Amino acid sequence: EAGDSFMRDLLKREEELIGYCREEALKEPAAMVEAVTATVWPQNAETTVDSLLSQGERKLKLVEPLRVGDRSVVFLVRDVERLEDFALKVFTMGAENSRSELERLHEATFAAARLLLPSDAVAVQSQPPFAQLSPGQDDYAVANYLLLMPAASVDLELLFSTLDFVYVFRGDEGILALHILTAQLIRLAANLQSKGLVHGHFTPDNLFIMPDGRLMLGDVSALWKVGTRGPASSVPVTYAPREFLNASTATFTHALNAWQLGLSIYRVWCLFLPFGLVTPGIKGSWKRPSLRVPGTDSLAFGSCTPLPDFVKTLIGRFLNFDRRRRLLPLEAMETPEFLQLQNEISSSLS
């Protein structure tokens, strides 16, 4: 709670800068943003939708675009008659089976529903759900399936890119923020572990600081029961350890999230990924596509922020290439290094 409130206040402090970088991030995909916006909101700021679940009819007012993903745009919207703001995720259709994939995503998400959960799923009125939405624009087909969720204050990917632009985390407060994020990441991963759960996408673009300062993990459809077998391709290649790159089908394990946890803590202190892995939107990044391509498999901290040794050690232990010897997050919290992290945070806060 103490750390949450500190993060909340820090977010408010950097609110204008985050907003600036958020807008900057939308310039490159402007054509996509405009085309998706024109599809979902072809008249003015409001569009009327029906819930696919029990929620009935809503009018969603566009406030502003928030973020672009590989095949999606996320908008800040308002349901005026409920007095509630939401993030709304809208999906583009490249694939011929985009429709069936989204139907599958819907079922997996809501069957499954620290975790950012959806609030509702809706479809534009007078048009079939999942099918391509009218009015169509040729460069960007949009599916009639809109996912409503609480809006994060910032995702870690955008935070890192913002810090790369101007490193506002200076002095003991910025350093403390790095400590708190490190501790939050570890506890989030530890919480999953405690429930025998594994997420395929424990990555900065799926890690969200909420308005109350809490760090949450998104996309409950990618949560697995530990030991479950699934498509290895569901793990982003730059966030996949070697054992997820050698097969069509992989076992989803606590070792996977130990690895991904190591990556994210490394990025907290370094901004780019380790091992020369390509990290879009960060200047210091090399171009290694994945670990299956040979490169620097040694863990290098030279171009990072000067991180404390207790953090270095924890990253090193999470990023053990041996899938049988990675430090798991619950175990990590019992280490002296985690104790030291907690005491640095406690001393600095009070």
């Binding site: 490193y167 030279g302 171009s303």
Partner: protein, 396 residues
Amino acid sequence: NDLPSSFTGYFKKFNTGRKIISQEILNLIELRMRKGNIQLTNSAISDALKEIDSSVLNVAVTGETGSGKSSFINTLRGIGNEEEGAAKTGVVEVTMERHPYKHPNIPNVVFWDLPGIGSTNFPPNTYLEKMKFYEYDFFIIISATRFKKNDIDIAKAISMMKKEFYFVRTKVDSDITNEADGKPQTFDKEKVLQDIRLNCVNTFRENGIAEPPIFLLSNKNVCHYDFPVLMDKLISDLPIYKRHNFMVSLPNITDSVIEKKRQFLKQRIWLEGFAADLVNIIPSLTFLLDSDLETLKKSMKFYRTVFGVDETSLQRLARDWEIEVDQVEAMIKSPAVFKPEETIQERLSRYIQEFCLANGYLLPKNSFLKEIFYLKYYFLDMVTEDAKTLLKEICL
């Protein structure tokens, strides 16, 4: 009233740290002057000047790729990044070997671009050994945008050897513009600078290093930030005999830097004037042989170059203000001196009267420097003023 006293007394009029020679050398020259052996007096002055002229300065610059090492080196050399002889980025990181870059006008001032430690497979202590740490007069860690672990590991290693380094934070103009663009409702130029500075200070302390000299500057705008104070600190850390060469090589970025160059060069004129023999005739009643005129023209050209008002320097200014050189030349005095209605002979005669009216003959009654040396003092004042005049334009 005695000549050796007048000779030493001139130097006492300059503040400690502005003296071109040590007390020991001054004592030796004064001693020989008192003993009346002119030949040994000359040789003492000659030796001192030669020791000064042949002094070599080796300045190391380390830091991450893209931190502004080559830019920093070029700025101190008064060379644009795209001009000939400019240090270029990236190259040292490939060779993994230091590369020397000489100052164009004072070639005994040498800057060494060092590869970032991360471009090598050297741990800090090995990296310092391989880069020949002990051979440098100054070792400068350049850092931009954010402190890297490598920067602090190198610093910790140097502190472990109980040696010294300077920390230079580049691209502060970029951080300022970026925070101004990103947070206008709360942006404050002075606060951003202070917070960058304290972050540097705090980073060293937190890592067990006594805070080194720290300088926040911009290779893109020398008219502001810590460039002047950096220069002050570097020269102060040098033995006296190396000061002249470093000083005259410095970019002409403040009135203080310019004035300080004038002070050093005034002492050089005094030494040269005494080495040449004092005379017993007033300089308004002597004339210049062609050998003197030649020495004068070469003196003016050296001064103009030192102070950045030489032909090449003026041309560069002209392109950038987008004008004809004759518009730049017209703002100052030195370019017209040896140019075609009052003859050159009348003109130099007038300069003597003006100088000696304003300043006297600098010496006990009935003793004088040779006329050429009053002229050099006059030229030095003129070139100094010319440099301040143009700097006012540039830094604005």
